[PDB]
Amino acid sequence: SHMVNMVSNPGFEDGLDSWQDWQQDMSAVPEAAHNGALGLKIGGGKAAGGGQDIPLKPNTTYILGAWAKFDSKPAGTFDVVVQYHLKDANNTYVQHILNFNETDWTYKQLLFTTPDVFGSTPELALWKGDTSKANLYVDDVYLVEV
């Protein structure tokens, strides 16, 4: 079966379309492509990233996945995250996190199950917290209902 990818412009083949650019250090470039013509490059030297809002169903399991690599050895990580608050008194911030520190193309995925009620709109974050000179490439991001 072909399962719908909920991520808009998931392979950056439409450049930066549908991705919020938080630090102005994102570019869609050939060298960052694992698939197709383009991938996302997040420039090194400081923490930077981007993301998009993706409304999710309650009490539902999702696959979150991505291909990523640093072009040189990072100090920290690049993280692919689905994050949202719970509707509780503590405003609990839930994060489903894939950590990447690899210097070769690497695919990782996780599965998570959403709560009964959301406290905020789920956000898919591509967060390169690493502050080394290493550039980060990411491509073919997936968010898929099971």
Ligand X SMILES: OC[C@H]1O[C@@H](O[C@H]2[C@H](O)[C@@H](O)[C@H](O[C@H]3[C@H](O)[C@@H](O)[C@H](O[C@H]4[C@H](O)[C@@H](O)[C@H](O[C@H]5[C@H](O)[C@@H](O)[C@H](O)O[C@@H]5CO)O[C@@H]4CO)O[C@@H]3CO)O[C@@H]2CO)[C@H](O)[C@@H](O)[C@@H]1O
Residue 38 among known ligand-binding residues: yes
What residues numbered 73-112 form the site for ligand X, per CB under 6 A?
Answer: 79, 81, 83, 95, 97, 99
- Which residue in 6, 7, 10, 11 binds Ca ion (CB under 5 A)? 11
Which one of Ca ion, ligand X, none interacts with residue 81, CB within 5 to 8 A by kind?
ligand X
137 near ligand X, judged by CB under 6 A: no
In the block, residue with structure tokens 């995250």: 81
Q: Angle 18-21-45 (CA atoms, 0-180°, nearest 5)?
A: 140
For residues 141 and 108, what is the distance between their CA atoms, to the nearest angstrom? 10
What residues numbered 34-53 form the site for Ca ion, per CB under 5 A?
Answer: 35-36, 39
Helix (H, G, I), strand (E, B) or coil at 19: coil
Residue 35 among known ligand-binding residues: yes
Nearer to ligand X, 35 or 109 (CB): 109
Closest to 76 measured CA to CA, from 132, 137, 22, 32: 132
For residues 63 and 107, what is the distance between their CA atoms, to the nearest angstrom? 13
- Which residue in 115, 123, 144, 145 binds ligand X (CB under 6 A)? 123
Question: Which positions from 18 to 37 touch ligand X by CB under 6 A, shown as an x/- string?
Answer: --x-xx--------------
Helix (H, G, I), strand (E, B) or coil at 56: coil
Which one of Ca ion, ligand X, none interacts with residue 33, CB within 5 to 8 A by kind?
Ca ion
Binding-site positions for Ca(2+): 11, 13, 35, 38, 139
